[PDB]
Design a binder for this molecule. Structure first.
Ligand SMILES: *[C@@H]1O[C@H](CO)[C@@H](O)[C@H](O)[C@H]1NC(C)=O
Ligand SMILES: *[C@@H]1O[C@H](CO)[C@@H](O)[C@H](O)[C@H]1NC(C)=O
Ligand SMILES: *[C@@H]1O[C@H](CO)[C@@H](O)[C@H](O)[C@H]1NC(C)=O
Ligand SMILES: *[C@@H]1O[C@H](CO)[C@@H](O)[C@H](O)[C@H]1NC(C)=O
Ligand SMILES: *[C@@H]1O[C@H](CO)[C@@H](O)[C@H](O)[C@H]1NC(C)=O
Ligand SMILES: *[C@@H]1O[C@H](CO)[C@@H](O)[C@H](O)[C@H]1NC(C)=O
Ligand SMILES: *[C@@H]1O[C@H](CO)[C@@H](O)[C@H](O)[C@H]1NC(C)=O
Ligand SMILES: [Zn+2]
Lengths: 213, 922, 182
């Protein structure tokens, strides 16, 4: 009869880390038994786990030795320790709750970049294009060039050439500036900053005018 | 208390500070005891002189230019008393540990008629010791047992000898007790019991079983208590001396820091030291570890005996030397662990396992071979560290070490090793009829140390305050810059159709059109990140080299790789953009092809003379392109003078000279720059600083290291005199002579002196170890173990850079000198800068000493490597998964560069126009 | 004077600072693991953040991403059977995947040439427009919490420098040759 508290089904306790997005339900169960009925306590990073700490409350199911959350918030991240004890003997286990706060969106480009510039011939030009995206964006610098006489191909699209495209060994912050040293009259035209993640696309263009000294 | 020593390996697992790893200063506490040891059968001799009986060793040596190694005469100390006491006079020592011969005082194993002649010998010795002021430490039993007590009672295997050893101890307390105040009863009972009867490798034995050994040690541990209590209630209230027992032990290190390895290490010390230390300093009973594995063959202590043995030691007599360490220690008693000669943590382990006792090291030092005479550098540096770690145990650990005793005043019979090993501070010639003592190098070291009581602070190793000259070149090295032939932009020549409407993707056309513009510097997306690391580093000069095998792959100058030439052009131009002068080298001994193109290396490499000509043309190409931005060039970048041959070195000097003349006659008037070699200049120091032969082999080694290539260029225009002398005297004159045209061509081809210093090595003339002895140069290469080392075992000697700077000035006159490379690899692989920050803080300061205290015209310091990506471990920036992070050495070096040296609290920010031509101005 | 300061910017983000590496989290109610790539190209689950589980996400085409093990120097590649492993060499036909976020906030990656969802388990199923996802296929990008000091493997192995011998005449290594001549 004098039995120490033990873990009945340890297979339900292998999931150590619980990482769910915002507004999600998490279930922490610590199955145990013993004679007589043991108590089940919860510790939030070594403190009191009172329902008045988090907004919305929770639901502890004593029939399954579990606790159910409701719309987790980043304030609920940390470690949760369940304690089981009845007579002489106190077993415990610590879980880890993480709330991954992320929201996908199309790549946002800073308004005004790139900007139209004119520093005549022989000077140095550098266009910029501030890009930000959660699923990591791809950057390409295009130049609207002209082939043969005109500059519009089939259907109704302009001819462009690849100036700078990100690849494998490519810094995410080096594709933000397009350098043009010396420059010439051939470089006069339109420069586009094509950026896109896995949702949509976004691009800003700017004309370059080359004068004379 | 037993078990409190398991925390030692934990506290020694993390190095606290780099200043503690060296601790080249500090003095021992006042009252410390400096001593020197001796024995009976080692030095006395005369096994049948003045009615002396016969010991167990007298019979073991007789019955296995003679064949058997015996101790009948040995050092012959029984007939030389004044001879031995004069050595103690010169050493300045305070104590002297010698032993009484049992077979000599009591020739009959029954305590019958004491020998008045034998007692007179020890009385005369003590009388002179009193006049000199040397307090004696007498060892009653030092492995010498009378033969009468062996064939009658069975030796130490009989407990009846506890009263016999009591009688022999009585008269010694009676006669000589008025003068002696430090008594050792048994010297190392471990080897006497274990190797005496169980193994049989000492004086007695027949190889029976370990049970005989444990039983002998049982009786040994009883006889000691009998003698201690004989001294406490009979002689102490009327004499006041202290009685202990000389206990020897080893040290062990774990395998993988696991709890099993640590517990097996504790078991090894409890089996060797705790075998006797715990039943004497703790509770009188054997350690619990030995009680488990020896639950049958180990004798049992009665309860009345445990209290009788407990507390029978007024201090802890520690023995630690070549006695059992790597010799007589049983291999099984190590328990699959590593034997280490670490004395520091052993002192800390005894300090914790026995409630902070008074430690008195009664025997230490190491040993040398039998052929080693008066020059014993190996022994003096072992003795140097042995006392160094002891000082660390006092200042940093808190161990109450009360005295030190370097073992063996003189050479003599070394037990089973015979005479093939020498341990004394004074050389003895056994083949001579005089056998007078001759002071060794260690004896002079010990003498000079006792006179100052440790290691007082020396003025040479003191921090220096002051600033470097204005426009002093500060920078880093990068011998293997990662090339970036792939351009970042304007590479794709095809045109596409951008579907601006609907899906905003690109559609390539099947035609061909448009062209390619000229590639500028921004196309190489690798220069600006490295330059960005150099800007925050406040580096004013960046040193790197070129890849000859990539510039001209086909050897000849017809198929030129202009791409990497533009890479190097932009590398130098963007450095001048941010006010960083580039220092460019041409050739390096790296790569499997001696740093040569594959065709030139396959056609003899430097053994072929045409390679030198191909170097000059390649030099001219580099001077034409990069010469517009580069103002400091280097022909050869630290050629391995220790690995090359003479045929290759001759053509190497040709190649450097040809390149220097090409720049001097075709590019100097248009490019205000300088060109010179860069030689690796590791410092060499004589092992014995007062030995002439060590000094001349140090000079010879220095000539083959630096003079081989510096003398034909900076000096007499010929090869070193010492090098040609030693080679011609060796009849192996395979060194080519300099013809008049070659001498006229090579001599003078230098605009400065680029030095490369990393560490200093020690050299000794005598052949200490044959398999580690350089026969081509006749030099024993050594190192001072007291120096702070790196994980790659590279010595940290800050003053060696000052020494090599003075040597180059003396050898080649006043001359603008650069420090082209100087650094040290990482340490601990977590706190890498604990060693490098201390390395640069002192190595730079010692360099400033040479500029001010010696007048060296230093022009620049170049820290070796600024990233581990190109040169692992040696970098200042860390490279971990495509990320460069600045180490603490970056902020410390930047602190030195910003302060321009080590300024104190006159204070001048001098901008002297341009001075001494150490560098130039933009 | 007008002067030129700059343009609006909000500096780096998730990682240690600009350590833009993330660990791919996976939960299947019963268990929970991270996508890990070993030095030999073996992909398994790591219950916590390890050095071999540090992954760099870098998009390539219009909506396709590249998953690289920053510690093993290997790329995540998928074959025709649906398996995934690590290769030291890039291949746009196999080591390239398409990313898309579902409704529950979990990221899913599938091969454009094999339609197989990158799954830690043995359930290499295709993709369906919101039907039944196979286990170990819904990932969650979690920030990195490991300092960049642990991301470089050591080197001082050097097994048996001089063995034990039990008779070493120079244990403290006072005699150190330097390998000269030739
Ligand atoms: C004492 O030893 C001597 C050996 O020199 C021996 O001749 C003598 O008989 C011994 N006497 C006794 C009483 O054992
Ligand atoms: C040692 O002698 C002192 C007297 O000075 C005495 O008090 C002490 O009890 C003695 N030790 C033992 C173990 O009897
Ligand atoms: C225990 O004793 C046996 C025989 O006495 C021996 O073989 C064994 O090595 C001992 N254990 C250890 C750890 O040495
Ligand atoms: C190429 O170099 C070799 C020597 O390596 C030389 O013999 C040959 O004439 C060269 N050829 C040309 C075309 O320069
Ligand atoms: C120059 O060498 C690089 C390799 O470092 C190679 O990629 C390039 O094609 C070479 N250029 C020429 C013109 O041979
Ligand atoms: C280099 O120094 C000059 C003056 O000596 C200064 O005008 C210039 O700004 C410096 N370069 C940089 C990149 O700061
Ligand atoms: C020494 O030179 C030889 C031949 O030149 C070469 O094979 C070897 O790699 C060099 N280095 C060493 C450490 O032997
Ligand atoms: Zn010497």
């Amino acid at each position: 009869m004098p039995v120490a508290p033990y873990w009945t089904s340890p297979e339900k306790m292998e999931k150590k880390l619980h990482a769910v997005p915002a507004a999600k339900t998490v279930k922490f169960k610590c199955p145990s038994s013993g004679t007589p009925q043991p108590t089940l306590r919860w510790l939030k990073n070594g403190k009191e786990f009172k329902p008045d700490h988090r907004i919305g409350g929770y639901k502890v199911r004593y029939a399954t030795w579990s606790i159910i959350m409701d719309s987790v918030v980043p304030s609920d991240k940390g470690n949760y320790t369940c304690i089981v004890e009845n007579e002489y003997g106190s077993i415990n286990h610590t879980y880890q709750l993480d709330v991954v706060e992320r929201s996908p969106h199309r790549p946002i480009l800073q308004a005004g970049l790139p900007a139209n510039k004119t520093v005549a011939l022989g000077s140095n030009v550098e266009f910029m294009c501030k890009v930000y995206s959660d699923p990591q964006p791809h950057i390409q610098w295009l130049k609207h060039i002209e082939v043969n006489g005109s500059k519009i191909g089939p259907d109704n699209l302009p001819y462009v050439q690849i100036l700078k495209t990100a690849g494998v060994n490519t810094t995410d912050k080096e594709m933000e500036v397009l350098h043009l040293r010396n420059v010439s009259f051939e470089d006069a035209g339109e420069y586009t900053c094509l950026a896109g993640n896995s949702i949509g696309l976004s691009h800003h263009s700017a004309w370059l005018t080359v004068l004379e000294a | 208390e037993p078990g409190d020593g398991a925390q030692t390996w934990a506290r020694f697992s993390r190095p606290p500070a780099p200043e503690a790893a060296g601790l080249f200063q500090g003095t021992f506490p006042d009252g410390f005891l400096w001593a020197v040891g001796s024995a009976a059968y080692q030095t006395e001799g005369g096994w049948q002189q003045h009615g002396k009986g016969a010991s167990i060793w007298d019979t073991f040596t007789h019955h296995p230019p003679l064949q058997p190694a015996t101790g009948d005469v040995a050092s012959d100390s029984y007939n030389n008393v004044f001879r031995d006491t004069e050595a103690l006079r010169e050493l300045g020592v305070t104590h002297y540990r010698f032993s009484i011969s049992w077979a000599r005082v009591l020739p009959n194993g029954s305590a019958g008629v004491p020998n008045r002649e034998g007692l007179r010998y020890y009385r005369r010795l003590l009388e002179r010791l009193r006049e000199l002021g040397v307090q004696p430490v007498v060892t009653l039993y030092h492995w010498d047992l009378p033969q009468r007590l062996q064939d009658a009672y069975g030796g130490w295997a009989n407990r009846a000898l506890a009263d016999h050893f009591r009688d022999y101890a009585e008269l010694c307390f009676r006669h000589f007790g008025g003068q002696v105040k430090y008594w050792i009863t048994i010297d190392n009972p471990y080897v006497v019991a274990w190797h005496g009867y169980a193994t049989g490798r000492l004086a007695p034995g027949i190889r029976g079983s370990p049970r005989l050994g444990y039983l002998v040690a049982h009786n040994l541990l009883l006889a000691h208590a009998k003698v201690w209590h004989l001294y406490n209630t009979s002689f102490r209230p009327t004499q006041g001396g202290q009685v202990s027992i000389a206990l020897s032990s080893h040290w062990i290190n774990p395998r993988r820091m696991t709890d099993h390895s640590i517990k097996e290490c504790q078991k090894s010390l409890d089996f060797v030291l705790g075998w006797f230390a715990k039943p004497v300093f703790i509770d009188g009973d054997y350690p619990e570890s030995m009680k488990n594995n020896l639950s049958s063959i180990l004798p049992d202590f009665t309860e009345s005996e445990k209290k009788f043995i407990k507390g029978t030691a007024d201090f802890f007599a520690l023995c630690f030397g070549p006695t059992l360490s790597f010799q007589l220690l049983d291999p099984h008693m190590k328990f699959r662990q590593l034997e280490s000669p670490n004395l520091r943590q052993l002192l800390s382990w005894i300090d914790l396992e026995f409630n902070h006792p008074q430690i008195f090291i009664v025997e230490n030092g190491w040993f040398v071979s039998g052929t080693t005479k008066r020059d014993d550098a190996k022994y003096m540096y072992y003795l140097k560290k042995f006392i160094m770690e002891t000082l660390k145990a006092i200042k940093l650990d808190g161990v109450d070490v009360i005295g030190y005793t370097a073992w063996s005043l003189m050479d003599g019979f070394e037990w089973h090793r015979g005479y093939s090993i020498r341990r004394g501070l004074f050389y003895v010639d056994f083949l001579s009829q005089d056998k007078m003592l001759l002071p060794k190098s260690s004896a002079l070291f010990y003498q000079k140390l006792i006179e100052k009581n440790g290691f007082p602070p020396l003025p040479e190793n003191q921090p220096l305050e002051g600033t470097f000259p204005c426009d002093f070149a500060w920078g880093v090295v990068d011998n293997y810059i990662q090339v970036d032939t792939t351009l970042s932009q304007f590479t794709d020549l095809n045109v596409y159709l951008w579907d601006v409407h609907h899906s905003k993707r690109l559609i390539k056309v099947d035609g061909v059109v448009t062209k390619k513009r000229k590639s500028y510097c921004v196309d190489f997306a690798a220069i600006q990140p490295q330059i960005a690391l150099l800007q925050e580093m406040h580096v004013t000069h960046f040193r790197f080299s070129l890849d000859w095998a990539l510039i001209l792959p086909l050897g000849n100058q017809s198929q030129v790789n202009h791409t990497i030439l533009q890479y190097y052009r932009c590398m130098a131009s963007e450095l001048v953009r941010v006010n960083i002068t580039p220092v460019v080298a041409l050739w390096q001994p790296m790569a499997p092809n001696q740093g040569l193109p594959r065709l030139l290396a396959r056609q003899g490499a430097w053994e072929n003379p045409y390679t030198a000509l191909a170097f000059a043309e390649y030099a001219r190409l580099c001077f034409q392109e990069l010469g517009h931005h580069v103002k400091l060039w280097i022909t050869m970048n630290e050629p391995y003078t220790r690995n090359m041959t003479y045929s290759a070195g001759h053509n190497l000097l040709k190649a450097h000279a040809l390149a220097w003349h090409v720049y001097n006659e075709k590019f100097r008037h248009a490019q205000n720059g300088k060109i010179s070699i860069a030689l690796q200049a590791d410092w060499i120091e004589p092992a014995c600083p007062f030995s002439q032969k060590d000094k001349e082999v140090a000079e010879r080694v220095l000539e083959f290291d630096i003079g081989w290539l510096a003398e034909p260029i900076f000096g007499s225009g010929d090869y070193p005199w010492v090098m040609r002398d030693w080679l011609n005297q060796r009849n192996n004159f395979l060194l080519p002579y300099f013809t008049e045209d070659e001498k006229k061509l090579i001599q003078g081809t230098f605009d400065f002196l680029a030095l490369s210093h990393y560490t200093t090595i020690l050299v000794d003339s005598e052949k200490e170890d044959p398999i580690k002895y350089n026969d081509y140069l006749e030099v024993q290469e050594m190192t001072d173990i007291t120096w702070l080392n790196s994980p790659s075992q590279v010595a940290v000697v800050p003053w060696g850079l000052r020494k090599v700077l003075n040597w180059l000035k003396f050898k080649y006159g006043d001359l603008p000198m650069y420090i082209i490379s100087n650094g040290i690899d990482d340490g601990l692989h977590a706190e890498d800068d604990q060693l490098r920050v201390y390395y640069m803080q002192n190595y730079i300061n010692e360099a400033l000493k040479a500029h001010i205290l010696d007048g060296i015209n230093l022009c620049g310091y170049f820290a070796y490597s600024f990233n581990d990506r190109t040169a692992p471990r040696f970098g200042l920036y860390r490279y971990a998964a495509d990320q460069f992070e600045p180490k603490a050495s970056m902020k410390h070096y930047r602190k030195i560069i910003d302060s321009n040296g080590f300024p104190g609290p006159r204070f001048c920010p001098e901008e002297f126009t341009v001075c001494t031509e150490c560098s130039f101005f933009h | 004077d007008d002067k030129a300061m700059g343009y609006p910017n909000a500096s780096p983000l998730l990682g240690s600072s600009w350590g833009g590496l993330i660990h791919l989290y996976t939960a299947t109610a019963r268990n929970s693991y991270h996508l890990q790539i070993h030095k030999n190209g073996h992909v398994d689950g790591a219950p916590h953040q390890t050095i071999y589980s540090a992954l760099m996400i870098r998009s390539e085409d219009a909506g396709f991403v590249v998953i690289t093990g920053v510690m093993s120097r290997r790329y995540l590649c998928m074959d025709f059977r649906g398996n995934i492993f690590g290769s030291h060499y890039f291949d746009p036909e196999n080591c390239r995947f398409q990313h898309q976020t579902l409704e529950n906030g979990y990221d899913v990656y599938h091969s454009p040439q094999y339609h197989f969802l990158v799954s830690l388990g043995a359930a290499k199923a295709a993709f369906l427009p919101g039907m039944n996802p196979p286990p170990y296929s819904q990932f969650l990008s979690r920030r990195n919490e490991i300092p960049l000091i642990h991301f470089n493997t050591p080197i001082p192995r050097q097994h048996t420098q001089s063995a034990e011998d039990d008779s070493e005449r120079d244990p403290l290594n006072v005699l150190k040759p330097r390998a000269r001549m030739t």
